[PDB]
């Protein structure tokens, strides 16, 4: 299709790589930041897979819902990872009035 | 159609849809079809048409 | 060969995208119908669902009804006589209007 | 559209280059036939001169 | 992009026709060279026959 596609889009590739690296760093070092919604976004398949792989370092993160156009196998992997870290539903202690 | 079959399988796996075990189709048992042993069948048993 | 190659190269993407979207929409409709509990066994389920066309639907329904109305009455005739077919019936069948083969 | 525009520009440039190369190449048979035409014209002129001179000489004799 | 593609296609078609007809006109240089060679050779043979007839008749009348 494009003999010089990489030559022309090296800048876009570099920017996407930088954004993905920042996302990975934030996910790994976010002890409190554990809920992320990257849905409805044009996140490339490679970038989404990189983010999912980086998630494994930080198990504190309890939620991340990413774009729907990510590969479906990776989507299932992300669902499994999020299920592995879903916070326990704290049973609301019903105060017995007296 | 090939891509959509992949998509359907992946969606089934995604939604934890236990794939209902498809009953193994009745084996094509080699029923007692008495192949008519015409004269010379044994003599031509395994002979290529060119031969 | 040249025209098939050209059509494959050119017209492929648009129809591919449109019909893949259509298949995904049918899959979503089936999932909504069955409350996302089971998915289609194979992609042929969409074709089975959309086999019939309106005019062809009516024509085939009429033909099937005409053919099948006789079968229901065949369960009762059990012990009637086995009379041989008449010569007149055979003669009529053989010498009737020589329809368009 | 970016891809199509780039590909069309490349195709146009390549076709122009090939046409220019072929135009530069083709000059040989033209030169050879030019030489042949010149030689034939020279022969024509020589034979016309022969006709004139020989006719004049014979007319003087007669 | 439809307008761009249509304009580029028209330009490419016009330039292709021009280059093809110019290469054909180089081959036409060759062909008209052959035509001129044929015409000049016909004239050469006509002038040779004129020379021969003139010389023979003049020698006879001498």
Curated annotation (Swiss-Prot), chains D, E:
Domain of life: Eukaryota
Coiled coil stretches, renumbered: none
Subcellular location: Cytoplasm, Cytoskeleton, Flagellum axoneme
Protein family according to the UniProt entry: Belongs to the DRC12 family.
Described function: Component of the nexin-dynein regulatory complex (N-DRC), a key regulator of ciliary/flagellar motility which maintains the alignment and integrity of the distal axoneme and regulates microtubule sliding in motile axonemes.
Quaternary assembly: Component of the nexin-dynein regulatory complex (N-DRC).
Name of the protein in question: Dynein regulatory complex protein 12
Organism annotation: Tetrahymena thermophila (strain SB210)
Gene transcribed to yield this protein: DRC12
Entire protein: shown range: 64 to 125 of 187
